[PDB]
Structure 1
Amino acid sequence: QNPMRDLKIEKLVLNISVGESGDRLTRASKVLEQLSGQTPVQSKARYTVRTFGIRRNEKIAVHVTVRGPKAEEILERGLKVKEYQLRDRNFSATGNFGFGIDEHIDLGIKYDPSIGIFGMDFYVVMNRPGARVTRRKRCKGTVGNSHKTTKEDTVSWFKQKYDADVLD
């Protein structure tokens, strides 16, 4: 029937993207370190654009991923800012979802005038238990059509838990 198709948040990836490396990104790193409690990873630019105002190898963005009851708590914090109202967009065909928060002083963080203000990109990677099979080194394999967490199951779960609406 449905014994172990528990459908638990795999990870929550909090992404901030600046077109500037130095003062403001050393601040944005301290912001994600403050929120999550993990020294984050400063993403490097893939190729120069010359229109947005970046070059390649220029250390443009910074992100972190959290796993488990922490990720659940930060998703609660971020959802209450989004009113527990997330469009039927924002929810990928592979049953993942995300949203963007402006002015990081929400979520019960202090302003921290020493650093300033920032926007974030929350992405919740949803998944059913026993998905190790795809990621483990030895004896790899793809999950069956049953175990594939689809859009409809992630939407209906996001309703049941968090007590939210899909707005569309």
Structure 2
Amino acid sequence: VMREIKVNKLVLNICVGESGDRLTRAARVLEQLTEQKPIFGKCRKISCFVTVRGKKALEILEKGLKRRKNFSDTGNFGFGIGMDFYVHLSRSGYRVTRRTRRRSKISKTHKVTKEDAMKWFQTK
């Protein structure tokens, strides 16, 4: 079948996934040690990140990352085995929701829920 979850829009770095303020401090010490660093993101002090497409980015992020059902219908997994970093979820037929020509929206039947996402988490 074709209903399964897919993903876009995440960001990465070369450290250990420190999170928050500490990641920014660690990056500044690392910047002082060696002048090489990656690129800007988009947000409203400052730090730098690697832009990588979708599914591949999520896989690296999950490995970096490492109530049982801490997860929520958002697609946000938090940190487990906070920051301004990107994280995301989309269902298979999602495009209708933002697609211009014939508008409409994803159905209640089509939507993810908690449970399918929980199966996906167990799957990896």
TM-score by length of 2: 0.59
Letter in 2 for 1:134: T
Q: How does 1:61-100 map to 2 (within 5 A)?
A: 66-79=52-65, 81=66, 87-89=68-70, 91-92=71-72, 94=73, 96-100=75-79
Letter in 1 for 2:69: D
Q: How does 1:1-168 map to 2 (within 5 A)?
A: 3-12=1-10, 27=28, 38-41=39-42, 43-44=43-44, 60=45, 66-79=52-65, 81=66, 87-89=68-70, 91-92=71-72, 94=73, 96-100=75-79, 120=83, 124-161=87-124
Q: How many residues of Structure 1 are paired with residues of Structure 2 in the alignment?
A: 108
Give the secondary-structure state (helix, strand or coil) at the position aligned to 2:93: coil
Give me the identity figure in percent: 44
Give the secondary-structure state (helix, strand or coil) at the position aligned to 1:129: coil
Going from structure 1 to structure 2, the CA distance change for 1:61 and 1:122 (only over 3 Å counts) comes to same
- Contact residue 7 and residue 55 of structure 2 kept, 8 A: no
CA deviation after TM superposition for structure 1 residue 159, in Å = 0.1
- RMSD over aligned CA atoms reads 3.8
- For structure 1, the residue ranges without an aligned partner over 5 or more in a row are 45-59, 102-118, 162-168
Letter in 2 for 1:99: G
CA deviation after TM superposition for structure 1 residue 131, in Å = 0.8
Q: Deviations over 1:77-135 (max 9, x none)?
A: 224x2xxxx8312x11x25122237xxxxxxxxxxxxxxxxx74666422222211112
Q: Deviations over 1:53-85 (max 9, x none)?
A: xxxxxxx56687754232233233224x2xxxx
Going from structure 1 to structure 2, the CA distance change for 1:88 and 1:132 (only over 3 Å counts) comes to same
Going from structure 1 to structure 2, the CA distance change for 1:145 and 1:124 (only over 3 Å counts) comes to same
**1-side partners of 2:112 and 2:74: how far apart?**
5
Whose RCO is larger (CA < 8 A, sep 6+)? 2
Greater C-alpha Rg: 1
Letter in 2 for 1:151: K
